[PDB]
């Protein structure tokens, strides 16, 4: 088995290493944790496709979080997994497929959820 940094939660690198990389073979790795989605439209897009980023959204609390006082402490972590894929265009019958067309996400969702479960 693996060895976890903590007993009951996973840091983003752990996600990118153990939930994303082993499931999606399309990504030859390239499950890259990042500080946040900030340098986007011309900094990160150059990465080879397909690839997936993992980045914190905001740290938050789900209830009482008074430090020190002898009561439980609850914490929340919002993080986002963003993929990137090309487009297949099979051009059947002397006609191309349009640059915009339905793309299958249900399969990706099912695979991801099954792995998380």
């Amino acid at each position: 088995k693996l060895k976890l940094t903590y007993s009951n939660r996973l840091t983003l690198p752990e996600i990118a290493k153990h939930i994303v990389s082993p499931t999606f073979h399309e990504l030859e790795g390239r499950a890259i944790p990042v500080t946040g989605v900030e340098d986007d439209k011309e900094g990160q897009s150059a990465i080879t496709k397909p690839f997936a980023l993992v980045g914190l959204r905001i740290g938050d609390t789900s209830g009482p979080a008074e430090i020190g006082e002898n009561s439980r402490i609850n914490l929340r972590d919002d993080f986002i997994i963003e993929f990137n894929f090309n487009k297949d265009r099979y051009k059947k019958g002397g006609a191309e497929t349009s640059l915009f067309s339905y793309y299958d996400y249900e399969s990706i969702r099912d695979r991801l959820f099954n792995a998380m479960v």
């Binding site: 496709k49 497929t97 640059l99 915009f100």
Partner: protein, 126 residues
């Protein structure tokens, strides 16, 4: 406009589309006009690994195309433009709007968005 300017040779096409069984949309484009034309850039471009232009806000043009005005033609939304050159790969333009050089009605100027430029581009249906 002067005669010498129109260096480029272009083919104007019309779009017909339908639906595959899988639900994805199919495009086929038919050549309708032939002639020389003059082309000017208006905006920068960013190419993906295979030259398909990447930009939001599809409605803004990038290249200006001018050719002889034709009273017997009725350009519309479904237009396109095609160009095959000596060495550089072919290219597809999408036509946005239209404008006479003036109401003198001598030359028709199109505003276009560049889409693709690579060896695999489909050539217009004759």
């Amino acid at each position: 406009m002067k005669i010498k300017d129109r260096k480029h040779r272009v083919i104007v096409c019309s779009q017909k589309s339908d639906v595959d069984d899988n639900g994805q949309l199919l495009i086929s484009r038919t050549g309708s006009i032939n002639g020389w034309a003059a082309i000017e850039p208006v905006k920068a471009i960013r190419f993906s690994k295979d030259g398909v232009s990447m930009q939001k806000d599809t409605f803004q043009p990038t290249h200006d195309i001018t050719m002889n005005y034709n009273p017997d033609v009725n350009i519309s939304v479904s237009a396109w433009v095609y160009e095959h050159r000596l060495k550089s790969p072919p290219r597809w333009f999408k036509v946005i709007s239209v404008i006479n050089v003036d109401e003198c009605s001598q030359f028709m100027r199109l505003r276009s968005r560049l889409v693709e430029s690579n060896d695999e581009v489909e050539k217009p249906v004759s």
